[PDB]
Amino acid sequence: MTTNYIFVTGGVVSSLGKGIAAASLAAILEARGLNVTIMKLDPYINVDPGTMSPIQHGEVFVTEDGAETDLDLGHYERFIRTKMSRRNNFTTGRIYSDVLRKERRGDYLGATVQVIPHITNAIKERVLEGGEGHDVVLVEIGGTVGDIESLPFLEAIRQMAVEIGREHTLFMHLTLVPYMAASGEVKTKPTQHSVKELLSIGIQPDILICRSDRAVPANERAKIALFCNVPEKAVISLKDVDSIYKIPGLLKSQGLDDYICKRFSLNCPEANLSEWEQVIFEEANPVSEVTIGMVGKYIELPDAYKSVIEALKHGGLKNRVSVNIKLIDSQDVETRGVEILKGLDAILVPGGFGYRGVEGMITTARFARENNIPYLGICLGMQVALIDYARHVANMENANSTEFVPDCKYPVVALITEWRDENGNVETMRLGAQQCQLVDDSLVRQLYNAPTIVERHRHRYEVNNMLLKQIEDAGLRVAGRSGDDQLVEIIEVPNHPWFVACQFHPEFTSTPRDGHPLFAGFVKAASEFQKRQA
Amino acid sequence: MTTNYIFVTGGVVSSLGKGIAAASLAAILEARGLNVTIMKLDPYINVDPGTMSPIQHGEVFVTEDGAETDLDLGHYERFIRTKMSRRNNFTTGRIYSDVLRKERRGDYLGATVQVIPHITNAIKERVLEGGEGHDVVLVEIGGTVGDIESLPFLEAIRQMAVEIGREHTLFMHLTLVPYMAASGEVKTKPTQHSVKELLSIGIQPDILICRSDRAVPANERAKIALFCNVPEKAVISLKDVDSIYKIPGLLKSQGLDDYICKRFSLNCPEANLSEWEQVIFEEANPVSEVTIGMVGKYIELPDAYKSVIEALKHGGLKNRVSVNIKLIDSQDVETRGVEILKGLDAILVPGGFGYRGVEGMITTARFARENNIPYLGICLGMQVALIDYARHVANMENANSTEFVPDCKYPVVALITEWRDENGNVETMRLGAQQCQLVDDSLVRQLYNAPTIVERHRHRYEVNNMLLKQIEDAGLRVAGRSGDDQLVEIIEVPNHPWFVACQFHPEFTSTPRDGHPLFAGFVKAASEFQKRQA
Amino acid sequence: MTTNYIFVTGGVVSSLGKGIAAASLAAILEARGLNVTIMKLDPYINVDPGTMSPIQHGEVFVTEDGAETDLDLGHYERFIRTKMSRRNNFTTGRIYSDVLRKERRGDYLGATVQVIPHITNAIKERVLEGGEGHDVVLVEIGGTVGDIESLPFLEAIRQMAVEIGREHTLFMHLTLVPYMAASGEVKTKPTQHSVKELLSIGIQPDILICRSDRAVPANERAKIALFCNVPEKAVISLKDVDSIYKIPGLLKSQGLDDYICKRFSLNCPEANLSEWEQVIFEEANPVSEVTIGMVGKYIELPDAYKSVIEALKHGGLKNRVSVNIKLIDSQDVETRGVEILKGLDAILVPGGFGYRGVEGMITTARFARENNIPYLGICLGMQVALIDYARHVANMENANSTEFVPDCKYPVVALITEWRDENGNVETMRLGAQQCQLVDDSLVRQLYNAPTIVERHRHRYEVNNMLLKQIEDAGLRVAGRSGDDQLVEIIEVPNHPWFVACQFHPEFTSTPRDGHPLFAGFVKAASEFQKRQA
Ligand SMILES: Nc1ccn([C@@H]2O[C@H](COP(=O)(O)OP(=O)(O)OP(=O)(O)O)[C@@H](O)[C@H]2O)c(=O)n1
Ligand SMILES: Nc1ccn([C@@H]2O[C@H](COP(=O)(O)OP(=O)(O)OP(=O)(O)O)[C@@H](O)[C@H]2O)c(=O)n1
Ligand SMILES: Nc1ccn([C@@H]2O[C@H](COP(=O)(O)OP(=O)(O)OP(=O)(O)O)[C@@H](O)[C@H]2O)c(=O)n1
Ligand SMILES: Nc1ccn([C@@H]2O[C@H](COP(=O)(O)OP(=O)(O)OP(=O)(O)O)[C@@H](O)[C@H]2O)c(=O)n1
Ligand SMILES: Nc1ncnc2c1ncn2[C@@H]1O[C@H](COP(=O)(O)OP(=O)(O)O)[C@@H](O)[C@H]1O
Ligand SMILES: Nc1ncnc2c1ncn2[C@@H]1O[C@H](COP(=O)(O)OP(=O)(O)O)[C@@H](O)[C@H]1O
Ligand SMILES: Nc1ncnc2c1ncn2[C@@H]1O[C@H](COP(=O)(O)OP(=O)(O)O)[C@@H](O)[C@H]1O
């Protein structure tokens, strides 16, 4: 068994959906019965994404092994059944850190560390590492062709293409075939130049992807084929669509995967894409509609809550119901008040970092709780709900986290070391998929149909425990606890129609094919409530 | 007085309106009291545009001196008063013809004729020729930057620029800033690369033109400025508009001309663009509307009748009336019949070549004539009308032209040498602006308010005097005769509300500010008819 | 006062002598009375040059402030009297280390750290730092134009050229105009392309340097001028010569510096290059010649002992005597023996790290000592000489250094902490220019004509004073000691015609115009001995 590789690059303009295209392909390759995986290389100097804000790049994906990574790794999880790990994504800065450390340790024995070799060697080794044991490995190259930000990576690839042999590697390239209304037609010249640029750095494209807002005419595809030294059959058109789960269908329709198996001499069984065909059918034919309002902070950039948004979608798919998302700034609920929260069927409060308008988040939690409006809390949102309930039911005035107020006097959230009561009596970070003990009598236990459940985490502060007993005894159900320390993983409100809040991140586990019990329940509750409020 | 030059190039995609931008600038420069002119270099092997069809490139402009040239030369005539000549436009093929001829006759004395320097010499000498005696010369380079089709021209320019000095030259480069709805924003990357391409061939841009369907944000303009080595104030945004006549206003708004005179150390007077402001006001505030139907052949690409369309628009401007042009295929009138011609306020028949469904054109002429529907015929449209009237009123069975049916028997149109009667008894191309003697008692004489007029021509066959007397005596007014041979330049129908047809090309003289008597009359009559029918 | 900058780049091939050219220019501009400084940007990933071997890049330059840097910084010291510091040279690796550390510290506040703008800003800042307070700053750009290894730097430069303004910056570029004997002529094509490459990254050259083995014809220079958009007067020819001290003369001859002052509007006084002319005269007219053996380890690459070689040259210039260096592998002395050392007028042993042929080095020291042959030892050579004398005169069997033998038994060299005697009783790196106390009665005190001196260091181990009294009392002169702990700096042999050795690196202070007492004495001694033996 020899591993085959396909490299994916993009030129002309960014924002073409390189990760989406690659993921859609991978889904097909999976559907062809092939051991396909995928990795993404980034042109960033930041070593880890944890040093950047969500407004800067959107939500940071949490892998099973706890690694923080590029959002697109979650996108990969939404197309194939393999698991992403730290080996599936790294940055330019990461490379330098490692190489410079090797320098420091004398690993280059007095030699000059150059871009070529050494830096490109580091890259090559990482690629071989991640692709080990797989039939097909897709590699997404971040950055735009022609920009200096990723030339080292492009070079490392070229080297490997030669080292490995062209019989085990293909060059895929995304372009833009923009529509010029003034002329009344699309243009292909930008594409022609993008290809020329790849050629100037030692790369000859094998497969072309024509991104546009409309199908590109065969004639134009032929013109491209001519100028790029590419067979007409390898020039694929990809018009804009209203769902990424329809793309596998399109790629299959144009015979892309057949071409690929032919190039790799693979005996590939007919792709079974019916899983997504089902999803598409259901997606395009919902029986109902609900409105969910989301109160947060980074709502000016949807990408910041991308994983959440898609998780909501997945719940809606299983319940055949349209999901509307109201973007609400917590600072406005703080300012304007709960009038914002009117006209909603359900309330959503996501996680994140930053005090900002958290008091408006608390206000919202109170609103949903007090008015019995289908409430879902995640990470910070749970902490918010904890505070809400604590202050108004358990009467823990000024309940808060020590991360914002050193002496809350009611620190409902704190570090384990920092656990303490209101009288000052006392007694790092949790990341990745961890097993939680569900309470057999809780809804969540029954939602998963299991005593325990493994879910992803990303957070430093925990439920106090010293003051927990005040909150829990006041009338709050701990629906599940962690492992060794039995930490409050998830809660439910005794008399609320649907109120669930948790520490884990279910949004990184939901799929379009499986959905996810908590979003299924949440969205359903929204519908129930909606019908009740009529 | 030393001539200053500005070169115009464009990259990324074609069809950005290089001629439009250049003409708009020139208009402003004229408005500032500067002696401005303009030339265009074309990347084609065709020596003369007369060897190509109307559908291939659209209408071929006829200059005063009879030269056949690029449509854009007519566009230049519509913005500045400087008259174009054969020296204002030539092609790659033209150059080679000249150079090879010089080789053949020994002008290079045994030397090797090379692109560099001999082809570039042909080019730069022609440029200096055309720019003689002018303050500012705009030079438009056709083709797209990065393509081999025009690299010789770009090289000739580079050399020239060095020779004359930077104090006498500026580089204006058009680009495209495409809007990507999927991202919700415009991109600049393509532009950055386009500039890099010019730089790679020795050209550093001074002024950037950002074509788009919307204003480009100052921030984006600044980003471009950075990467292109260009001052922010020299980065001009140019969004799509509904009228070319509004462009001078936009360029003026962004201070383009001030920059230019500063660069050329010229004490330039403030631009008076009120002439176009008037036009714009009138254009945007017509008092009425009218439907004009046009029957022809090259309607599958409006460019073929561009000069006509503009002329109709100009008539509309003077009569504050919207002109609605219906495109009708002569072959459909031939097939379907006159039902096509219903719902029209007036009918127009353009010139051109090709028999095709001209019988339907004749049918149309008959229709408009017999139903008293305002009619305007140009060149071929006159030939058509001549046949119509001759065959159906003067009883000239099979009235026709020898260019299609030599054995006509009633050749109403024929080469002067070919003039003959129905008994076989007998007795190149007219080009450019020629004097026409108008009949003092004709409407056209009074429409122009002058004994004679001067108008452009292009045709080979003439009205057959041998049979003319039958037609004219039957009841048709010859509204004007040429000169030496008193050739029927223009006719009018005695009892038709407004039926005028002529040999000359009034559409090459009409401007948005001056208008033109025949379009003023036609369009007005069209409106009048409409009102008479309502 | 505003700082002016000149950037120096080069392409086509490596090894053109960019640093040499820049240094020669600086010398002229020094002679024009300008505040000239100079920096070099190192494309390597190594953070410090200390992590690379002498064979990898030759000798590593020691700056006054103790920084280790590129050899060319010493070359700068040999053309201008200003002082280099850590601010005059840094690497690519250094940049990343700094930036990543800033990232780690939260310096970019959650933003994406990108090459553009963050890496380039790091560069920009360092350039402004080093050039602060100077009239003219030369900046040598390492690497080769067109290679990805230095594109980030080239970009940072472009940006600064724009932000600073062209009135304060120039682009100088070295090329190769190779001689093609098969054709019988030189070619310019490579140059034309090199320039095009700079242009493609936003850089337009102002000054061209044509490296070759012969003067380039004015015609060819004109051809280049044409294709590069450069004035003929700015195309400088630079043929190969037998001395780098003749280059200022050549550059002056072609009017380079005048051009520069005109570009910077400087009223520069006529260059006084007579000091260099003197050096040249003396160089080209020695009255004698001597042969000096150099016993070492890195002799396979001259560059490893470059600073030493030049120091020897300078001594020869002052004594009008040719210096013939015989490179000798100390390992061959171990194999073949002292027969290698025959036919020499003087013996020299350079510094360095590694055992290899050190025992042979000792054998050589012994040979020169015992046979009264003008000996000069530096750093390691001193350590060697110490062992020689100690073992063979002070009877310190196996006199040695703890850097090679944990239990030397007679550790004549050791870390200060490691100082111990032969009975086991006891009691980082010295860098940069340090004050040494000379013994008034020593030869070197009188050679320097001063009580104390300041000289550069680069070593960790010291003379073990526990056993010094054995060595010194046996009959050996300590000619100088250091500071606080009076560490042994210089040793002289009581009855040897001329045998000295020292801890410091005099080769980093020697200049072509000033010379250096030590090397003057050494080379002189060689001559004296030569005559003594004749
Ligand atoms: N020749 C250059 C110029 C720019 N960049 C890269 O250009 C990118 C900027 O373009 P893009 O990522 O697409 O986003 P913006 O900078 O906002 O601009 P645009 O989308 O128009 O390119 C930066 O990441 C920078 O690393 C580079 O590497 N090489
Ligand atoms: N590197 C190349 C490749 C093609 N061409 C030019 O590429 C142009 C094609 O683009 P364009 O003129 O805009 O029209 P089309 O050929 O239809 O294609 P498109 O509009 O997409 O460029 C042709 O004119 C051809 O002369 C060239 O000169 N040099
Ligand atoms: N397109 C490339 C190719 C090479 N390198 C760099 O090229 C340098 C090597 O070239 P050079 O210094 O000239 O020496 P060699 O590699 O030995 O080969 P040569 O001298 O023939 O160029 C290396 O540092 C490598 O990082 C690069 O940056 N970009
Ligand atoms: N970018 C350019 C520049 C020059 N030329 C070609 O450059 C050649 C000149 O180089 P070459 O034939 O090698 O001889 P010379 O002109 O004498 O100069 P050289 O040999 O140094 O190139 C000319 O034929 C000319 O056609 C060209 O086609 N494209
Ligand atoms: N053909 C498609 N239809 C519509 N937009 C799509 C399609 N495939 C790609 N995209 C869009 O591309 C974007 C991907 O964003 P981003 O993560 O920046 O892309 P990339 O993977 O290229 O970095 C999404 O907004 C997605 O809607
Ligand atoms: N900003 C503008 N608004 C709208 N379209 C414009 C504008 N400027 C350029 N164009 C369009 O560009 C086209 C010019 O066609 P063409 O003659 O091919 O241009 P070029 O001069 O670039 O060859 C026209 O259809 C015109 O409407
Ligand atoms: N014109 C000149 N005459 C002879 N050789 C020269 C001249 N200018 C440069 N050099 C040579 O250039 C070499 C410089 O080597 P190196 O330091 O590797 O170059 P760089 O500093 O460009 O990397 C020396 O061997 C020197 O003799």
Swiss-Prot record, chains A, B, C:
Activity regulation as described: Allosterically activated by GTP, when glutamine is the substrate; GTP has no effect on the reaction when ammonia is the substrate. The allosteric effector GTP functions by stabilizing the protein conformation that binds the tetrahedral intermediate(s) formed during glutamine hydrolysis. Inhibited by the product CTP, via allosteric rather than competitive inhibition.
E.C. designation(s): 6.3.4.2
Annotated positions binding UTP: 14, 187-192, 223
Pathway the protein takes part in: Pyrimidine metabolism; CTP biosynthesis via de novo pathway; CTP from UDP: step 2/2
Positions with a binding annotation for Mg(2+): 72, 140
Summary of subunit composition and partner proteins: Homotetramer.
UniProt name for this protein: CTP synthase
Organism expressing this protein natively: Escherichia coli O45:K1 (strain S88 / ExPEC)
Gene name in the database record: pyrG
